[PDB]
C-alpha cells in the first residue's frame, strides 16, 4: 500500500504530522492511563494537487488507523435531508473502528460559509457537521483531518477550538522535493541513463506533485509516440520486452517541460535559499553583523537570555542597486537553514494601487507558519518612489502598505522566529517610522563590491559557463574600478552571448562547407569554440558600463554619515 | 503628519479620526471613569479642537531626562542584565 | 460521416487533440499493460461557432470511440431532481460502450458557478457532476470533453486535477484557416471560375467557421435571388441542371461580405504575422540582433545551455513614429514562425482608465497558451503620456498597468516561449523599472529609414498598385532626405488617390461623350490611365511632408548616447 516512501517532496510537514499522530494512534492505550487531550482535528491546507489526501492515506496506513474518506461533493451531491444521514453514518462507522482517521477531502464544499453563508440546506450541513465535530466525546481515537485550499475559505467556526485546532500548510514542493517527487513518479518506466532528473527538477520550478506526475506521463507519451509507432507492431497487449527497449530521453523530458503549464506558478514560494556566502565575495563586516543579528539568538539563545537582552528582529539594507542585498539576505537565510520569503516591490505596489493592504496580514501569517523564516521586503521604498520622492504627495511619508507592515511588525515578535529584512536603494525617502525601535532599526550599508569582492562576483557569475584558464579574472576585477554586481553580471552575460554567437555562426558555416563540398571522409574537428576565451571577454568589456554613478554613492555616503555616532564621546573613559 | 505638517492638505487640521475622537469625548464624561491621555511629539500640528475645554486641555510637557532621571533610566534598563558594580552608573548618566 | 477533412481552419489545435487522444482511444489495449494515466478530461474553449462540437465529433468518428453528446440546456431544461438522473444515465451509457467520448456542449450552463453560485438546485447539479467526473475509476477509456466560451466561466472545481486537467483554446480561425473553412463550406455549390475564395478569405478577417458558413449561404441566396427568379419557372423540386447552370459570382460574395457582421471581431487575434523581412528595407544590424535574441535560443538551445547563459526574453524598440517597429516585430515573429500578439496603446489606456489591470493577467495567460508567441506591447508609453510627460502627476513613473505588466513578466520566463517586445516613441518617459534585468532590458533603436531602406519601403507600399516602369523609385527614395516610413506611405497613398480620381473623372467624361454623341461603332479604347505614371507621383510628392522633425530625432540620439558604453575601456587588453 501507500506509505512514507510514496509521500514525496520531503517538505518536512509530513514529519510534523507524524509527530502529531503517532502517539494518538501508534500508542492509543497510553492516552487511556494519562490525562491529556490529543489532536481532535488537523487541517491540511495548500495548493491543490499537493498530495494532502495521499499524505492522510499514508499516515493512516503507516499507523494502522482505519482510514475513512468523506468526499466533499460526494455528500454535497446527495439529496438534501439525506446527506446529513451520510455524514452521521460516516462518523459512526469511523467511531466503530477505533482508532480511525476520517479524512474530509475538499472541506471548502461542505462548509464553505465564510459568514456570507448563502442558501438554506448548506447552513444545515455546516451546523450539523459542527455538532458532530464538537460532539466527539473524547472517547475512542478518531482523528478528523480535512483538506482545504486556504484556511480562510472554510467556515470560521470549523477553525475554532476543538473542531480544527491545528493547521499544516503542505505548500508547493521545493527543488529537493520536486526531485524526490520526480523520483517517486519515475520508478517503473525504466528511465534512461542520460536523463538524470536533476536538471529537470531545477527547471521544474512552479510545478506541484500532480504537475510533476503529469509532466512525467507526458514525457512517457512522447517517448511512446516517437518510437514503437513507426514499427506499428501492435497487439492486444504490447510485449513487455518491446516496451522496455525504449528509454525516456532527455529531449522528451525537455519537451514535456516546455508543455507543462504549472498549476500555480503565482503562488508564493516558501523555500530555503540555495545561495551561499561563496556567491558574495566579501562584506565580512556586514557578513559578521548579519550572522550576529540572525544566527546568534538561535544558536545561543541561553546567552541572550542570561544578559536579559532581546535581539533585534529587523534589519534594513541600504545601498546602490545591484550590490547584492537580495543575495546577502538569501545567504543569511541559508546559513541559518531557515525558510526565506521575498516580497518584491511589484507586490507592494500592487497592494498599494489596489488599496488592498490586508494581504500584508496574510503574508505575515504565512511567514509565521513557516518558522524559522527570513521575511525579506525587497525594495521597500517602491511606494515612496511611486508617490514621488522630490516633492511627492502633499501628505507625509506614511502610506497604507507601510502602515500595515508596521502594524504587523508591532504585533509580531511574538513568534520569536520571523526575521524582517528590508532592502532600499533610496534610504532618504523611506518612512522614518520604519527605523524606530521594534522595527527595522539595524541599518546596514552595502557598499560597491571591492576588488576582491568583484573577483568573487565574477567567479560566481562564470562558474557555470566554460571559461578558459587563459582569461585572468583577477585582472578583470581590478580593471573594473567601480562596477556594481549588476554591471559585472552584464559583462559576463555579454561575453557569453558573444561566444555563443561566434560558435553558432562558425558551426553553421562549417556545415555549409560540407554541404557545398561533400568531403570523402567524415572527420568532425569538434567545436571551434569550446570555451570562453580572452578575445570574447575583451570584446564584452569593450561595452562594459558603470550603472551606478558616483553622485548617488555620494548621497549614500551622506546618509551613512547621517547616522553619525556623535563627535565627543570617542574618548569616553570611566573615572578610575 | 501623514497629511503633511509644513504645507499639508489644502484643508485645515480637522480629519475624520480626530473628529470621531472629539465626538466620543464630547459624548463621554458620562462614565466618570475613563480618562483620556494623549501623547504627541508635534504639538504645533495637533488640531486645536483637541485642546478645548472638555477635551485634552491639561497640557503637560515632558522634558529630556535630567542627570538624576538619566541615572534612574539607566538603572531601570539595566535591572535585568547582570551589571558589575565596578561600572559606575551615576558617572555615565552625568556624562550623557 | 464527419472527419478531419470536415474540420477546417488548420488552426493546429486539432493536431494537438489528435496527439492527445489516439493512444487512449486508437490504442486502448496498450494502456492496460502499461501503468500510465491518460487524459481523463479535455476542456475545449473558444469563441462560439468555432466548431468545438464538430471537432469532438470528428475525433470520435476517426478514432471509433462511441460519441455521446450531453447538451448543457438539454439537462438544464429538465425538471429538478430528475436531471441528475439524466447526467448519471449519460455517464453510465458512455461507460457501457467503452471506449467512449462524452461531449458536454455549453458546459458553462451545467456548472456556471464561479464561486458566486446562485440558486440551490444548480449547486446540486454542479456537485453531482463533480462527483461523477472525479468518480471515473480509471477503468474503461471514457474521455470527457467539454465546450466553454472561456475557461473562467465554468466552476473552478471543474478546472482542478482529474476533472478537466488540460485545456485547448480553439480560437478564431486565421486567413489560412478562413480560406480552408471557405473551401470546406464551398464544395457542393459549383463555385464559379472567377471567384477564387482567396480575396474573400483575406477580406474575411473577424469571421468564425459559423460566420464563414453563413456568408457562403448568403452569397448562394443572393445568386438564387439574382437569377432563376426572373424566369420564375418553379416546381415541387427545382431541376438539378437548371440550378447547376448558375455560378456564384465574385459580386455576390462581395455583397455577402458587406452583409456579414462577424460574430466576434473584437476578440483578440493570435496569428502568425504574414509580414516578412522584405517589407523592411534594411535594419541589418537591428535585423541580426533581433534574429539573435529571438531565434537563436530556439534554433540552437543546446549551445545556449552549454555556456550556461539564459537568453533575454524582452526587447524594447525605441525610435521616431512611423519607422517600422510594429512591422519589425511582425517580421521577427514570422521568421521564427511563432504566434504574434499585439497589445496596442488603446488597450492599455482602456485598462488604465477603467482601473482593470487583471486583463494583463488574462493577456499573459493567452500568450502563454499560444506558444511560441511574440507578445508585443505596442506604444507602451501611452499611459505615461496620458498622465503627462513634462510635469505629469505628482507621483513617479509607476502606474497600475505597467506594474501589472512587470508582475506578469517577473512571474513569466517559466514558459520559456513567450517573448516580450516593447515599442515606445518616448523612451525618456518610460518607467525605468521596465528596463531592469529580467524585463525589457535589450534596448534597440530604430532610426529613420536610409536611402536603400526608403527604396524598399516605397517598393513594399507600391507592390500591389500598378506602377509604371517609367517612374524611377530609387530617385524618389533618394530625393526624400528624411522621410519616415509613414511619410513614404502617405506619398504613395496620395499618388494612388490622384491616379484613381483622374481615371474616374476621365472615364466619366468619356461616357458622357458616348451618351451625348452616340458613336455608330462601339470601340472602347480601354482605360485612359491603366497604371500610375510619373506625373501622378510628381503631383503627390508636391504634397510630400516630413512628419518627424529633427529635434525629436535629436532627443532620440541623446537617449541613445545616454546608453553610452563608458569612455575608458575601449582599449581594454588582458595582461600578457
Ligand atoms: C531567551 C530568549 C530567546 C528569543 O528568541 C530566540 C529565537 N528562537 N528562534 C528564533 S528565529 C530564526 C532564527 C534564524 C531565522 C530566524 N529566535 C530569534 C529571536 C530574536 C532575533 N532572531 C531570532 C527572544 C527573547 C529571549 C529572552 C531575553 C531576556 C529575558 S529576561 C526576563 O530579561 O531575563 C527573557 C527572554
Ligand atoms: C463628586 C463628583 C465625582 C466625579 O467622578 C469621580 C470618579 N470616580 N471614578 C473616576 S475614574 C478612575 C480613576 C483613576 C482612573 C480613572 N472618577 C474620575 C472623575 C474625573 C476625573 N478622573 C476620575 C465627577 C463629578 C463630581 C461632582 C462635582 C461637583 C458637583 S456640584 C452640583 O457643583 O456640587 C456634583 C458632582
Ligand atoms: C537550455 C535552455 C533553453 C531555454 O529556452 C529555449 C526556448 N525554447 N523555446 C523558446 S520561445 C520561441 C522562440 C521564438 C519565439 C519565442 N525558447 C526561448 C528562451 C529564451 C529567449 N527566447 C526563446 C531557456 C534556458 C536554458 C538553460 C541555460 C543554462 C543552464 S545551466 C544550469 O547554466 O547550465 C540550464 C538551462
Ligand atoms: N509528493 C508526492 N508524491 C507522490 N504523488 C504526489 C505527490 N504530490 C502530489 N502527488 C499526486 O497528486 C495526485 C492527487 O493529488 P492529491 O493527493 O489528491 O492532493 P489534493 O487533494 O490537494 O489535490 C495524487 O494522485 C498523486 O499522484
Ligand atoms: N472549421 C470548420 N469547418 C467546417 N464547419 C465549421 C467550422 N467552424 C465552424 N463550423 C460550423 O460551425 C457550426 C456550429 O458551430 P459548433 O461546431 O457547434 O461550435 P460551438 O459549439 O462553439 O458553437 C457547425 O454546424 C459548422 O458548420
Choose, out of A48, A73, A74, A348, the residue to mutate when testing the contact with C (most C CBs < 10 Å).
A73
CB atoms within 10 A of CB A113: 19
Q: Are A325 and A444 in contact (CB under 8 A)?
A: no
What cell was used for C97?
A: 460502450
Give the residue from C205, C228, C258 where a domain finishes. Answer: C258
Min Cα separation A570/chain C (Å):
42
Indicate the DSSP class of residue B6: S
Strands A339-342 and A41-45: unpaired
Instruction: Kindly write down the DSSP assignment for every residue of C4-42, as one continuous string.
Output: TTTS-S--SSHHHHHHHHIIIIISHHHHHHS-----SEE
Question: Does any domain span residue A361?
Answer: yes
Question: Does any domain span residue C336?
Answer: yes
Q: Are C23 and A224 in contact (CB under 8 A)?
A: yes
Total domains present in chain A: 4
CA distance A513 to A405: 65
What cell was used for C45?
A: 474553449
Cα end-to-end span (Å), chain B: 30
Q: Are A311 and A293 in contact (CB under 8 A)?
A: yes
Q: Are C164 and C179 within one domain?
A: no
Question: Does any domain span residue C311?
Answer: yes
Q: Ligand nearest A108 Cα, by number?
A: 4
Question: Does any domain span residue A487?
Answer: yes
CA distance A451 to A473: 11
At C249, which CATH number?
A: 1.10.8.60
Q: Are A245 and A392 within one domain?
A: no
Q: Are C14 and C162 within one domain?
A: yes
Using CA atoms, how far residue A90 sits from A54, A135, A199, C132, in Å, is 20, 14, 45, 20
Nearest to C101 by CA among C1, C20, C4, C210: C20
CB-CB neighbors (< 8 A) of A395 in chain B: 2-4, 8-9
Out of B3, B4, B91, closest to residue A574 by CB: B91
Phi, psi of A144 (to 5 degrees): -100, 110
CA distance C304 to A543: 21
Give the residue from C169, C189, C211 where a domain finishes. Answer: C169
Q: Ligand nearest A11 Cα, by number?
A: 4
Strands A314-318 and A339-342: unpaired
Q: How many CB pairs under 8 A join A and B?
A: 33
The vertex-C98 CA angle with C97 and C103, nearest 5°, equals 80
Largest CA distance in chain B: 59
CA distance C215 to C217: 5
For A270-282, what is the HEC assignment? CECCCCCHHHCCC
Q: Are C61 and C2 in contact (CB under 8 A)?
A: yes
Residue A237 in contact with partner chain C when CB distance is under 8 A: yes
CB-CB neighbors (< 8 A) of A206 in chain C: 414
Using CA atoms, how far residue A557 sits from A289, A552, A561, C337, in Å, is 19, 9, 6, 52
CB atoms within 10 A of CB C174: 22
Contact C130 A240 (CB under 8 A): no
Which of C12, C45, C50 is the best mutation target for the ligand 5 pocket, counting ligand atoms within 8 Å of the beta carbon and taking the most? C50
What cell was used for A214?
A: 503529469
CA distance C60 to C63: 5
CA distance A361 to A375: 13
Min Cα separation B32/chain A (Å):
31
All residues at 6 or more sequence positions from C210 whose CB lies less than 8 Å from its CB, including other chains = C48, C49, C50, C51, C263
The vertex-C38 CA angle with C35 and C42, nearest 5°, equals 170
Q: Is the CB of C13 under 6 A from ligand 5?
A: no
What cell was used for C11?
A: 488552426
Question: Does any domain span residue A335?
Answer: yes
Q: Are A145 and A24 in contact (CB under 8 A)?
A: no
Question: Does any domain span residue A254?
Answer: yes
Helix pair A358-369, A400-410: axis angle to 10 deg: 40
CB-CB neighbors (< 8 A) of B6 in chain A: none
What cell was used for C229?
A: 427568379
All residues at 6 or more sequence positions from C470 whose CB lies less than 8 Å from its CB, including other chains = C533, C534
Nearest to C175 by CA among C193, C199, C211: C199
Distance C7 CA to ligand 5 centre (A): 8
Burial A56-80, CB ≥16 within 10 A → b, else e: bbbbbbbbebebbebbbbbbbbbee
Q: Are A363 and A428 within one domain?
A: yes
CA distance A266 to A261: 12
CA distance C518 to C520: 6
Using CA atoms, how far residue C110 sits from C72, C76, C82, C104, in Å, is 6, 7, 14, 9
Question: Does any domain span residue C269?
Answer: no
Out of C34, C308, C414, closest to residue A205 by CB: C414
Nearest to C324 by CA among C463, C461, C493, C480: C461
What cell was used for A375?
A: 521575511
Largest CA distance in chain C: 101
Helix pair A250-258, A209-226: axis angle to 10 deg: 120
Residue C354 in contact with partner chain A when CB distance is under 8 A: no
At C307, which CATH number?
A: 3.40.50.300
Q: Are C181 and C161 within one domain?
A: no
Q: Are A369 and A336 within one domain?
A: yes
Give the residue from C126, C152, C169 where a domain finishes. Answer: C169
CA distance C487 to C448: 11
Centroid of chain to Cα C130: 34
- Extract the runs of DSSP E, i.e. beta strands, from C150-289: 166-169
CB-CB neighbors (< 8 A) of C411 in chain A: 265-266
Burial C442-479, CB ≥16 within 10 A → b, else e: bbbbbbbbeeebbbbbbbbbbeeeebeeebebeebbee
CA distance C347 to C359: 10
CA distance A332 to A391: 36
Q: Are C116 and C140 within one domain?
A: yes
CA distance C42 to C167: 6
- Annotated binding residues of A, as ranges? 48-54, 149, 185, 322-327
Question: Does any domain span residue A334?
Answer: yes
Helix (H) or strand (E) segment spanning residue C195: none
Q: Are A202 and A245 within one domain?
A: yes
Residue A306 in contact with partner chain B when CB distance is under 8 A: yes
Q: Are A420 and A474 within one domain?
A: no
Is residue C235 reached through a cis peptide bond, with omega within 30 degrees of 0 on the bond before it?
A: no
Is A570 exposed, middle or buried (CB count within 10 Å of its CB: 0-12, 13-18, 19+)?
exposed
Instruction: Kindly write down the DSSP assignment for every residue of C338-382, as one continuous string.
Output: -EEEE--HHHHHHHHHTT-THHHHHHHHHHHHS-SEEEEETTTTH
Nearest atom in ligand 2 to B33's CA: 11
- Extract the runs of DSSP E, i.e. beta strands, from A128-267: 143-148, 166-169
Q: Are A54 and C111 in contact (CB under 8 A)?
A: no
Nearest to A405 by CA among A357, A373, A442, A369: A357
Q: Are C23 and C114 within one domain?
A: yes
Min Cα separation B3/chain A (Å):
4
Range of the domain at A50: 4-169
Spell out the alpha helix ranges (H) of A99-185.
Answer: 107-110, 121-134, 156-159, 175-185
Phi, psi of C423 (to 5 degrees): -120, 135
Contact A466 C307 (CB under 8 A): yes
The vertex-B32 CA angle with B27 and B35, nearest 5°, equals 80
Residue A161 in contact with partner chain B when CB distance is under 8 A: no
Q: Are A545 and A525 within one domain?
A: yes
Which of helix, strand or coil describes residue C298? helix
Nearest to A186 by CA among A168, A203, A172, A198: A198
Q: Is the torsion defined by CA of C185, C186, C187, C189 positive or negative?
A: positive
Residues 383-422 of A with CB under 8 A from C: 385-389, 391-394
Q: Are A101 and A59 in contact (CB under 8 A)?
A: yes
- Extract the runs of DSSP E, i.e. beta strands, from C155-225: 166-169
Q: Are C249 and C290 within one domain?
A: no
Residue A468 in contact with partner chain C when CB distance is under 8 A: no
- Identify the bridge partners of residue C422 per DSSP, sorted by sequence position: C316, C377
Using CA atoms, how far residue C78 sits from A148, A417, C90, in Å, is 33, 58, 14
What cell was used for C369?
A: 497558451
Residue A309 in contact with partner chain B when CB distance is under 8 A: yes
Q: Is the CB of C354 under 6 A from ligand 3?
A: no
Out of C157, C369, C570, closest to residue A542 by CB: C570
Amino acid at each position: 500500500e501507500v506509505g512514507y516512501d510514496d509521500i514525496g517532496g520531503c517538505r518536512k510537514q509530513l514529519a510534523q504530522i507524524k509527530e502529531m499522530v503517532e502517539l494518538p494512534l501508534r500508542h492509543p492505550a497510553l492516552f487511556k492511563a494519562i490525562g491529556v487531550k490529543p489532536p481532535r482535528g488537523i487541517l491540511l491546507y495548500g495548493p491543490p494537487g499537493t498530495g494532502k489526501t495521499l499524505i492522510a492515506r499514508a499516515v493512516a496506513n503507516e499507523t494502522g488507523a482505519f482510514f475513512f474518506l468523506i468526499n466533499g461533493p460526494e455528500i454535497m451531491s446527495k439529496l438534501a435531508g439525506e446527506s446529513e444521514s451520510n455524514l452521521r453514518k460516516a462518523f459512526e462507522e469511523a467511531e466503530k473502528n477505533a482508532p480511525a482517521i476520517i479524512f474530509i477531502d475538499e472541506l471548502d464544499a461542505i462548509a464553505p460559509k465564510r459568514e456570507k453563508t448563502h442558501g438554506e440546506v448548506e447552513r444545515r450541513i455546516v451546523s450539523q457537521l459542527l455538532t458532530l465535530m464538537d460532539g466527539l466525546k473524547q472517547r475512542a481515537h478518531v482523528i478528523v483531518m480535512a483538506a482545504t485550499n486556504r484556511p480562510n475559505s472554510i467556515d470560521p467556526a470549523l477553525r475554532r477550538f476543538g473542531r480544527f485546532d491545528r493547521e499544516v500548510d503542505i505548500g508547493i514542493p521545493d527543488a529537493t522535493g520536486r526531485l524526490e517527487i520526480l523520483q517517486i513518479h519515475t520508478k517503473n518506466m525504466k528511465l534512461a541513463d542520460d536523463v538524470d532528473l536533476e536538471q529537470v527538477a531545477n527547471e521544474t520550478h512552479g510545478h506541484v506533485g500532480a504537475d510533476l506526475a503529469a509532466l512525467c506521463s507526458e514525457a512517457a507519451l512522447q517517448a511512446i509516440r516517437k518510437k514503437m509507432d513507426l514499427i506499428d507492431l501492435e497487439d492486444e497487449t504490447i510485449d513487455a520486452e518491446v516496451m522496455n527497449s525504449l528509454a525516456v530521453t532527455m529531449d522528451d523530458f525537455r519537451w514535456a517541460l516546455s508543455q507543462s503549464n504549472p498549476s500555480a506558478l503565482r503562488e508564493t514560494v516558501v523555500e530555503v535559499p540555495q545561495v551561499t556566502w561563496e556567491d558574495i565575495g566579501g562584506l565580512e563586516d556586514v557578513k559578521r553583523e548579519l550572522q550576529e543579528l540572525v544566527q546568534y539568538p538561535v544558536e545561543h539563545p541561553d546567552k541572550f537570555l542570561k544578559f536579559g537582552m532581546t535581539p533585534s528582529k529587523g534589519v534594513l539594507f541600504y545601498g546602490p542597486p545591484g550590490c547584492g542585498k537580495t543575495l546577502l539576505a538569501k545567504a543569511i537565510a541559508n546559513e541559518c537553514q531557515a525558510n526565506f520569503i521575498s516580497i518584491k516591490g511589484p507586490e507592494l505596489l500592487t497592494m498599494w494601487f489596489g488599496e488592498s493592504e490586508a494581504n500584508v496580514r496574510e503574508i505575515f501569517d504565512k511567514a509565521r507558519q513557516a518558522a524559522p523564516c527570513v521575511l525579506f521586503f525587497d525594495e521597500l521604498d517602491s511606494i515612496a518612489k511611486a508617490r514621488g520622492g522630490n516633492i511627492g504627495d502633499g501628505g507625509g511619508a506614511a502610506d497604507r502598505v507601510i502602515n500595515q507592515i508596521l502594524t504587523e511588525m508591532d504585533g509580531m515578535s511574538t513568534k520569536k522566529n520571523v526575521f524582517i529584512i528590508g532592502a532600499t536603494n533610496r534610504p532618504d525617502i523611506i518612512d522614518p517610522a520604519i527605523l524606530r525601535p521594534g522595527r527595522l532599526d539595524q541599518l546596514i550599508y552595502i557598499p560597491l563590491p571591492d576588488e576582491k569582492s568583484r573577483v568573487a562576483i565574477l567567479k560566481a557569475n562564470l562558474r557555470k559557463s566554460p571559461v578558459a584558464k587563459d582569461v585572468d579574472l583577477e585582472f578583470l576585477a581590478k580593471m573594473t574600478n567601480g562596477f556594481s554586481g549588476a554591471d559585472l553580471t552584464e559583462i559576463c552575460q555579454r561575453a557569453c552571448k558573444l561566444a555563443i554567437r561566434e560558435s553558432i555562426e562558425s558551426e553553421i558555416r562549417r556545415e555549409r562547407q560540407t554541404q557545398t563540398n561533400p568531403s570523402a571522409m567524415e572527420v568532425e574537428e569538434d567545436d571551434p569554440v569550446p570555451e570562453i576565451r580572452r578575445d570574447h571577454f575583451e570584446e564584452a568589456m569593450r561595452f562594459a558600463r558603470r550603472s551606478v554613478s558616483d553622485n548617488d554613492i555620494r548621497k549614500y555616503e551622506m546618509f551613512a554619515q547621517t547616522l553619525q555616532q556623535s563627535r565627543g564621546f570617542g574618548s569616553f573613559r570611566f573615572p578610575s | 503628519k501623514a497629511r503633511g505638517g509644513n504645507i499639508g492638505d489644502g484643508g485645515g487640521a480637522a480629519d475624520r479620526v480626530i473628529n470621531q475622537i472629539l465626538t466620543e469625548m464630547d459624548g463621554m464624561s458620562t462614565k466618570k471613569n475613563v480618562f483620556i491621555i494623549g501623547a504627541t511629539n508635534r504639538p504645533d500640528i495637533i488640531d486645536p479642537a483637541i485642546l478645548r475645554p472638555g477635551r485634552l486641555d491639561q497640557l503637560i510637557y515632558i522634558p529630556l531626562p535630567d542627570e538624576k532621571s538619566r541615572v534612574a533610566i539607566l538603572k531601570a534598563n539595566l535591572r535585568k542584565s547582570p551589571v558589575a558594580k565596578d561600572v559606575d552608573l551615576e558617572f555615565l548618566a552625568k556624562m550623557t
